[PDB]
Amino acid sequence: ESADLRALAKHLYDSYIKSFPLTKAKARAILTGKTTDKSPFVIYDMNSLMMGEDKIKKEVAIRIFQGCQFRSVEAVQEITEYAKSIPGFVNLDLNDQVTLLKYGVHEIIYTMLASLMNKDGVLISEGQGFMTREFLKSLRKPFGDFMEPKFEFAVKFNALELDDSDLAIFIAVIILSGDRPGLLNVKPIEDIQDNLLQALELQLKLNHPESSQLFAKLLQKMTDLRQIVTEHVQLLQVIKKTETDMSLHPLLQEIYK
């Protein structure tokens, strides 16, 4: 029944709004001058970077990098709260639950990162600030190319014009992979994902009826996520070797194995 699929979609959207304080709908209202929300202080160089705490509640590159790192640990926390709400996920073997998160968590971070980006920069501090792509790329090596592959993806991805009710099901599909390395019981995972994929497919054609093959173009985007993740991992191993004094969160170290 299509009707059970819509109920699942409604359930996941509601759980996505409850788990993530900054939705794409809010992010786009901030980014584009809407009166439902307020304007971000823009950071484009070092003076505005230090002017930035005068509005938004060590060297500059390592400080920015370690805040982006604190934020990621926070998103991991929000993603795990979302994941538990995906029907059947808490019912799986605990070891497989850990494996799905470990491998799914960064692909979801960069999907939702895209909600907070345009070609020019990225919202920070829950929408209160905006950090210019040009500033980030001007950071000293090896940090200037830290964010550029996320912007390249985001610009391509934001072109699909997905909204939060689409994204809620898509990030569920990402978690419930079943081709993840080290999974004990693949088949229960594949059964949950086949359901999510049916819910996503219906959602896309009801919400985007004039968008030809949007289901397939979005599933292809999963290729770009995998490559962002693997590049970021390699870049981190270079930062850790040249910056032996920069501390990495154990939660992120446990995932990066």
Ligand X SMILES: CCCCCCCCC(=O)O
Binding site for ligand X (CB under 6 A): 52-53, 56-57, 124-125, 129
Using the rule CB under 6 A, is 59 a contact of ligand LO7? no
| Closest CB to ligand X among residues 56, 197 | 56
Using the rule CB under 6 A, is 66 a contact of ligand LO7? yes
Is 256 known to sit in a ligand binding site? Answer: yes
Tell me the window of 63-71, 197-205, 235-243, 247-255 that interacts with ligand LO7 (CB under 6 A): 63-71
Is 180 known to sit in a ligand binding site? Answer: no
| CA 103, chain centre distance (Å) | 13
Q: What is the smallest separation between the CB atom of 148 and ligand LO7, expressed in angstroms?
A: 11
Using the rule CB under 6 A, is 147 a contact of ligand LO7? yes
Using the rule CB under 6 A, is 249 a contact of ligand LO7? no
Is 234 known to sit in a ligand binding site? Answer: no
d(C-alpha 28, C-alpha 59), whole Å: 31
- Of residues 75 through 114, those in contact with ligand LO7 by CB under 6 A are none
Is 69 known to sit in a ligand binding site? Answer: yes
Using the rule CB under 6 A, is 125 a contact of ligand LO7? yes
| Residue 52 binds which of ligand LO7, ligand X, none (CB < 5-8 A, kind-dependent) | ligand X
| Residue 64 binds which of ligand X, ligand LO7, none (CB < 5-8 A, kind-dependent) | ligand LO7
| Residue 57 binds which of ligand LO7, ligand X, none (CB < 5-8 A, kind-dependent) | ligand X
List residues near ligand LO7 by CB under 6 A: 63-64, 66-68, 70-71, 122, 124-125, 131, 147
